Write an enzyme that holds these catalytic residues in place. Structure first.
Site, PDB file in Angstrom:
ATOM      1  N   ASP B  93      52.740  28.840  57.082  1.00  0.00           N
ATOM      2  CA  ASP B  93      51.580  28.219  56.469  1.00  0.00           C
ATOM      3  C   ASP B  93      51.188  28.988  55.208  1.00  0.00           C
ATOM      4  O   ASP B  93      51.656  30.103  54.955  1.00  0.00           O
ATOM      5  CB  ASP B  93      50.424  28.083  57.462  1.00  0.00           C
ATOM      6  CG  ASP B  93      49.972  29.410  58.038  1.00  0.00           C
ATOM      7  OD1 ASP B  93      50.080  30.454  57.363  1.00  0.00           O
ATOM      8  OD2 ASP B  93      49.464  29.400  59.179  1.00  0.00           O
ATOM      9  N   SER B  94      50.342  28.372  54.392  1.00  0.00           N
ATOM     10  CA  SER B  94      50.043  28.951  53.090  1.00  0.00           C
ATOM     11  C   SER B  94      48.897  29.945  53.131  1.00  0.00           C
ATOM     12  O   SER B  94      48.733  30.725  52.183  1.00  0.00           O
ATOM     13  CB  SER B  94      49.710  27.842  52.096  1.00  0.00           C
ATOM     14  OG  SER B  94      48.532  27.166  52.482  1.00  0.00           O
ATOM     15  N   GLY B  95      48.105  29.931  54.196  1.00  0.00           N
ATOM     16  CA  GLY B  95      46.885  30.702  54.253  1.00  0.00           C
ATOM     17  C   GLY B  95      45.635  29.941  53.868  1.00  0.00           C
ATOM     18  O   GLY B  95      44.529  30.431  54.128  1.00  0.00           O
ATOM     19  N   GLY B  96      45.767  28.744  53.289  1.00  0.00           N
ATOM     20  CA  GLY B  96      44.594  28.039  52.789  1.00  0.00           C
ATOM     21  C   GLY B  96      43.625  27.625  53.882  1.00  0.00           C
ATOM     22  O   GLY B  96      42.406  27.688  53.698  1.00  0.00           O
ATOM     23  N   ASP B 142      46.708  24.989  49.617  1.00  0.00           N
ATOM     24  CA  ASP B 142      45.793  23.858  49.508  1.00  0.00           C
ATOM     25  C   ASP B 142      44.432  24.268  50.039  1.00  0.00           C
ATOM     26  O   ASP B 142      44.156  25.448  50.269  1.00  0.00           O
ATOM     27  CB  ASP B 142      46.304  22.664  50.326  1.00  0.00           C
ATOM     28  CG  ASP B 142      46.259  22.922  51.830  1.00  0.00           C
ATOM     29  OD1 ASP B 142      46.353  24.099  52.232  1.00  0.00           O
ATOM     30  OD2 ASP B 142      46.141  21.955  52.609  1.00  0.00           O
ATOM     31  N   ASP B 266      52.983  21.516  64.997  1.00  0.00           N
ATOM     32  CA  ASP B 266      52.743  22.872  65.472  1.00  0.00           C
ATOM     33  C   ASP B 266      51.359  22.903  66.088  1.00  0.00           C
ATOM     34  O   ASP B 266      50.475  22.153  65.672  1.00  0.00           O
ATOM     35  CB  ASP B 266      52.747  23.908  64.343  1.00  0.00           C
ATOM     36  CG  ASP B 266      51.476  23.857  63.503  1.00  0.00           C
ATOM     37  OD1 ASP B 266      51.406  23.019  62.578  1.00  0.00           O
ATOM     38  OD2 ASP B 266      50.534  24.627  63.784  1.00  0.00           O
ATOM     39  N   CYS B 304      60.152  19.953  85.688  1.00  0.00           N
ATOM     40  CA  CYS B 304      60.448  20.852  84.583  1.00  0.00           C
ATOM     41  C   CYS B 304      61.678  21.703  84.865  1.00  0.00           C
ATOM     42  O   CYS B 304      61.840  22.251  85.956  1.00  0.00           O
ATOM     43  CB  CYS B 304      59.244  21.759  84.379  1.00  0.00           C
ATOM     44  SG  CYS B 304      59.460  22.953  83.065  1.00  0.00           S
ATOM     45  N   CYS B 306      62.474  24.521  83.266  1.00  0.00           N
ATOM     46  CA  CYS B 306      62.352  25.863  82.717  1.00  0.00           C
ATOM     47  C   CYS B 306      62.590  26.932  83.785  1.00  0.00           C
ATOM     48  O   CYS B 306      62.537  26.681  84.992  1.00  0.00           O
ATOM     49  CB  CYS B 306      60.997  26.062  82.024  1.00  0.00           C
ATOM     50  SG  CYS B 306      59.630  26.681  83.056  1.00  0.00           S
ATOM     51  N   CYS B 309      59.766  27.461  86.406  1.00  0.00           N
ATOM     52  CA  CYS B 309      59.706  26.485  87.481  1.00  0.00           C
ATOM     53  C   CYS B 309      60.901  26.584  88.417  1.00  0.00           C
ATOM     54  O   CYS B 309      60.820  26.115  89.557  1.00  0.00           O
ATOM     55  CB  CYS B 309      59.540  25.084  86.893  1.00  0.00           C
ATOM     56  SG  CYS B 309      57.935  24.868  86.112  1.00  0.00           S
ATOM     57  N   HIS B 335      56.617  28.478  80.367  1.00  0.00           N
ATOM     58  CA  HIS B 335      56.594  27.122  80.902  1.00  0.00           C
ATOM     59  C   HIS B 335      55.994  26.128  79.906  1.00  0.00           C
ATOM     60  O   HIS B 335      56.540  25.037  79.705  1.00  0.00           O
ATOM     61  CB  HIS B 335      55.834  27.036  82.226  1.00  0.00           C
ATOM     62  CG  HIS B 335      55.497  25.627  82.573  1.00  0.00           C
ATOM     63  ND1 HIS B 335      56.423  24.743  83.098  1.00  0.00           N
ATOM     64  CD2 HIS B 335      54.371  24.910  82.346  1.00  0.00           C
ATOM     65  CE1 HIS B 335      55.855  23.554  83.220  1.00  0.00           C
ATOM     66  NE2 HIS B 335      54.613  23.628  82.766  1.00  0.00           N
TER      67      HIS B 335
HETATM   68 ZN   LIG Z   1      58.395  24.885  83.839  1.00  0.00          ZN
END
Ligand SMILES: [Zn+2]
Ligand SMILES: NC(=O)c1ccc2nc(NCCN3CCOCC3)[nH]c2c1
Ligand SMILES: NC(=O)c1ccc2nc(NCCN3CCOCC3)[nH]c2c1
Ligand SMILES: [Cl-]
Ligand SMILES: [Cl-]
Ligand SMILES: [Zn+2]
EC number: 2.4.2.29
Lengths: 369, 369
Positions: B93-96, B142, B266, B304, B306, B309, B335
């Site tokens: 990101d730009s920081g704005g 921006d 994001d 899930c 992952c 899990c 997770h």
């Molecule tokens: Zn999971």
């Protein structure tokens, strides 16, 4: 399949020994360092990471677990191994030290205490809690005498601990599943007094245990005094069973204790001090928060084989710890536990090769340079 | 070897698109979710774990990094990728937005501010910081108009942002190494006003960017209004470049934004709310701290894939979060990030197969049941 318990000594040098403990859930290489898993976690590490550092066994804390999440609850959930995801041996402390350190009314029956709700801990209840957790190595319920202690108070405390050791033995033996699948260690007390240490060793050997801890040390006496007490205390214990020095310690404490016949160790130092910014290196500890590390691209230690030292710089870990980032705690802890395990490996290899005395001298010359 | 930047659309359904961005450091599958790495770490995760969840790219925060550890310092240490150990694309990101959210004196030149030491951020300095970090996708500097905004103030803010977008373009192009190896995205502003959104899109397209963000949303307007603005705003952007909705969002926000032509997302929600006890599931979010989970042996989510899990129960993670244990944050975060990536994978596959409309309907019916 492995036995319930078999300790075998493969090599010796002076009082130092190296070998293995075989148990149902795995083999423990000795001398061994046990990472501490206080509240069913080795702080900031997945169990797979604990294992990747080389640990064969971890320590769990009865006192914390009986308060949160509860021993009966853990049993209902399948036991501590399943709950936390560590399938190898676990040694559980009895709660006797922690109850007096963190919580009290003491009596011949046990200790009643308020959580930091009222609770009770007797030899029988401690052994039961350790059963409910599914401990592989169960510690007898004792009393860690404060330091300094007068001879009279050290004697009274040790005598009560020996009565509690017999009660612990009988409680353990009266639970068939526990007696057949776990091991039970007794704890020598007696403060710094040779005659009391001898009486305690004799009482424990008469009862009979699978291993023997040296209790009551690392409670403020300092290394010189600890070593002096170990000098006479360890030879009093049965030679053919493991010797466990509870709560020790710094790397140089471990080396000197092995020179005096100790086979097993546990300490919060690598985990707790790692989270606080202290990293162990072969040239001594460093505090990664120090500004001198802000642009240091070297790994924490120049020889360490751990995953942290393979990838990340001192500068990055300095930033993480200064920023309070969780990853900083994770990386410091993994490195410190790996360092401790590498120390134990060097100890085991040097004893096996008959060069441990030289290793201890070289280790100290560089660590304290 | 891969190009500096190439976005290719492989399949479409309505306004939704799926495809790839090819960059020097890797391929980004779209629609994409970018885990947020605030202070050079995705909180509580090693980069290898971030990658294992399926992330192709992470977001870094210029504002935080310029304050700690510093942009020039990171450059001297080899850049952000080397510093944190993530070798794939990073969008900065730009920081704005952050400078006005966390720190101020605004002017046509930029923003001066005090850290939460005085500091300066202009379009030129923002682009330079992102260069020093070694960003792969650089955001124009921006101003994120507060909500609600009057038409006059939204117009003034958008007009300044468009002047700053041209300054950002020229600063980026005047740095040969950056222009040849990174990409630059422009940010559409205009609050909730269709005519201002159109003027902003026209100005950005005239300057020309590698991708186009929809800025100024998820600042308090609510989902109905956000979707209404996306309905008219996304079609204004060039169809053949990625569309990035900054700071969004909850799973249902992502699904509806994809239905409206967004390719990149994001949000701190999976990481931040994971540390706070909120776990995402296909049946909606749960708060793992709730007492109903204390003895629940099921994984966080029943489908899930992952690693969390696969191994640990709700009951264990409940205990860890209640106890304040670092491992609780680690497991919840892994997770939640894995859940977000699985959502993106289901989105991509369903668009590729021409069944995204049905997926969105099925997803909502179950998530909000
Ligand atoms: Zn999971
Ligand atoms: N039961 C015992 O005698 C005992 C248990 C844990 C200990 N932890 C330390 N020291 C750590 C500081 N000394 C200890 C003694
Ligand atoms: N530059 C921008 O217009 C911008 C940047 C970051 C943002 N993050 C949010 N929302 C997160 C809450 N909205 C945002 C807008
Ligand atoms: Cl600890
Ligand atoms: Cl976060
Ligand atoms: Zn290391």
């Amino acid at each position: 399949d492995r036995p319930r318990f078999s300790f075998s000594i493969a090599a010796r040098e002076g009082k130092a020994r190296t070998g293995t403990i075989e148990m149902k859930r795995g083999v423990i290489r000795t001398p061994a360092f046990m990472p501490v898993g206080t509240a069913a976690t080795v702080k900031a590490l997945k169990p797979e990471t604990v294992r990747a550092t080389g640990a064969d066994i971890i320590l769990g804390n009865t006192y914390h677990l009986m308060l949160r999440p509860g021993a009966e609850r853990i049993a209902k959930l399948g036991g501590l191994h399943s709950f936390m995801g560590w399938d190898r041996p676990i040694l559980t402390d009895s709660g006797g030290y922690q109850v007096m350190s963190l919580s009290t009314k003491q009596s011949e029956e046990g200790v009643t205490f308020k959580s930091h709700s009222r609770h009770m801990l007797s030899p029988e209840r401690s052994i039961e809690i350790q059963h409910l957790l599914g401990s592989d190595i169960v510690m007898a319920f004792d009393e860690c005498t404060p330091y300094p202690a007068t001879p009279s108070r050290a004697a009274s405390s040790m005598e009560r601990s020996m009565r509690w050791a017999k009660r612990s033995r009988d409680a353990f033996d009266s639970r068939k599943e526990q007696a057949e699948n776990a091991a039970l260690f007794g704890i020598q007390q007696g403060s710094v007094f040779e005659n009391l240490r001898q009486q305690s060793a004799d009482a424990l050997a008469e009862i009979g245990f699978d291993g023997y801890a040296v209790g009551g040390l690392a409670v403020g006496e300092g290394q010189d005094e600890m070593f002096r007490v170990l000098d006479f205390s360890v030879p009093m214990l049965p030679d053919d069973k493991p010797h466990y020095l509870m709560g020790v310690g710094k790397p140089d404490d471990i080396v000197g204790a092995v020179e005096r016949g100790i086979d097993m160790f546990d300490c919060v130092l690598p985990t707790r001090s790692g989270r606080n910014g202290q990293a162990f290196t072969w040239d001594g500890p460093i505090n990664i928060r120090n500004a001198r590390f802000s642009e240091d691209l070297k790994p924490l230690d120049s020889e360490c084989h751990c995953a942290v030292c393979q990838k990340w710089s001192r500068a990055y870990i300095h930033h993480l710890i200064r920023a309070g980032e969780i990853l900083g705690a994770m990386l410091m802890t993994e490195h410190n536990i790996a360092f401790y395990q590498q120390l134990m490996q060097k100890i085991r290899d040097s004893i096996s090769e008959g060069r441990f005395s030289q290793f201890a001298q070289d280790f100290r010359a560089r660590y304290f340079a």
